Amino acid sequence: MQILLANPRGFCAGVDRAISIVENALAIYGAPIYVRHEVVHNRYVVDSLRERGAIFIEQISEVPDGAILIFSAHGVSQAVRNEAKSRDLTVFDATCPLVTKVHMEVARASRRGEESILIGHAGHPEVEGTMGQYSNPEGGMYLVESPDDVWKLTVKNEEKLSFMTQTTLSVDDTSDVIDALRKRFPKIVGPRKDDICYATTNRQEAVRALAEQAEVVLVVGSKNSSNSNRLAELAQRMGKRAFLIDDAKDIQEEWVKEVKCVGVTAGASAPDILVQNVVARLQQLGGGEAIPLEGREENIVFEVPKELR
Ligand SMILES: C#CCOP(=O)(O)OP(=O)(O)O
Numbered sequence: 001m002q003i004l005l006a007n008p009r010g011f012c013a014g015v016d017r018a019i020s021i022v023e024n025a026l027a028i029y030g031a032p033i034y035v036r037h038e039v040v041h042n043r044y045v046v047d048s049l050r051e052r053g054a055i056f057i058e059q060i061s062e063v064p065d066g067a068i069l070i071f072s073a074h075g076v077s078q079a080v081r082n083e084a085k086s087r088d089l090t091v092f093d094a095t096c097p098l099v100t101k102v103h104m105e106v107a108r109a110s111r112r113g114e115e116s117i118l119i120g121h122a123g124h125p126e127v128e129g130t131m132g133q134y135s136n137p138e139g140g141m142y143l144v145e146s147p148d149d150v151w152k153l154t155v156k157n158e159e160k161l162s163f164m165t166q167t168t169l170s171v172d173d174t175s176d177v178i179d180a181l182r183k184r185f186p187k188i189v190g191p192r193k194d195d196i197c198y199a200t201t202n203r204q205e206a207v208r209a210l211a212e213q214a215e216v217v218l219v220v221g222s223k224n225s226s227n228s229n230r231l232a233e234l235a236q237r238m239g240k241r242a243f244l245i246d247d248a249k250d251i252q253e254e255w256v257k258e259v260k261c262v263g264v265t266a267g268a269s270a271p272d273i274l275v276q277n278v279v280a281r282l283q284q285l286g287g288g289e290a291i292p293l294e295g296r297e298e299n300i301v302f303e304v305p306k307e308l309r
């Protein structure tokens with residue numbers, strides 16, 4: 001059985017920075033370090049950090065006065081930021097710079113009292129954080145997930161309207177939403193394309209190439225990782241069986257029995273050791289040396305804040 005590896009795969013720059021922020025805080029201040037929400041959506045990274053003394057909480061009311069609190073890569077609303085500020089907390093912000101960039105635009109529209117529409121998945125922490133940058137009652141902030149949501153949205157002033165997106169969406173489905181937004185609201189303003197980040201766009205391009213060759217695609221990532229689930233969905237829509245798995249223990253023998261080519265990739269929040277264990281298990285199941293596909297080069301690094309070197 002041939003094993004192919006997608007390229008790029010695995011950690012993005014914002015995840016590598018966010019995990020470093022927590023590790024460095026642990027190293028400098030000791031346990032406990034509180035983290036609002038899973039720092040990234042990966043069970044193995046979060047369980048690990050928990051074992052080292054990070055305590056993951058959903059609400060600031062769970063954190064003791066005097067504590068150090070880190071905000072996760074996905075970002076937080078101004079309400080959450082203000083609640084930490086008003087509390088006795090020392091805060092470090094692991095929000096990825098590419099999320100913060102969207103936040104700055106939503107805050108700008110808020111100050112102007114002009115309405116904004118976010119394309120994103122309800123309930124996801126990045127969407128809570130981004131919607132939570134808008135607070136002007138004279139304007140409005142609306143969420144759409146699909147073209148049907150667009151066809152039902154009414155706004156107060158469609159002449160002054162802008163849109164933003166979550167960073168980890170499907171590139172193809174978001175294109176359909178924007179096409180519907182521009183049909184319904186021809187004066188809407190946005191970025192040139194969307195706010196989907198380079199790592200999400202690149203891993204979906206890489207999974208498309210992988211799926212063209214492989215019969216089955218395994219995506220290493222946790223169930224709550226949006227970007228990871230997009231990679232599995234992309235391969236399934238190309239007619240390949242694709243499974244989102246946390247680790248090698250999840251691989252069911254029947255998924256690869258009699259398969260000639262299996263592809264492996266990993267979401268932006270999944271560490272490379274999990275991919276190496278998955279390859280080792282595919283080799284038990286008859287796979288050869290893993291062959292890396294050629295891929296788009298990534299070169300971006302985001303440094304930790306100077307206070308945490
Ligand atoms: C932030 C970030 C990148 O990865 P995850 O933590 O998996 O996040 P989402 O893909 O937005 O769910």
Ligand code: SF4
Nearest residue numbers: 012014096098167197
């Ligand atoms: S998936 Fe993109 S926006 Fe999210 S942390 Fe990674 S680089 Fe940043």
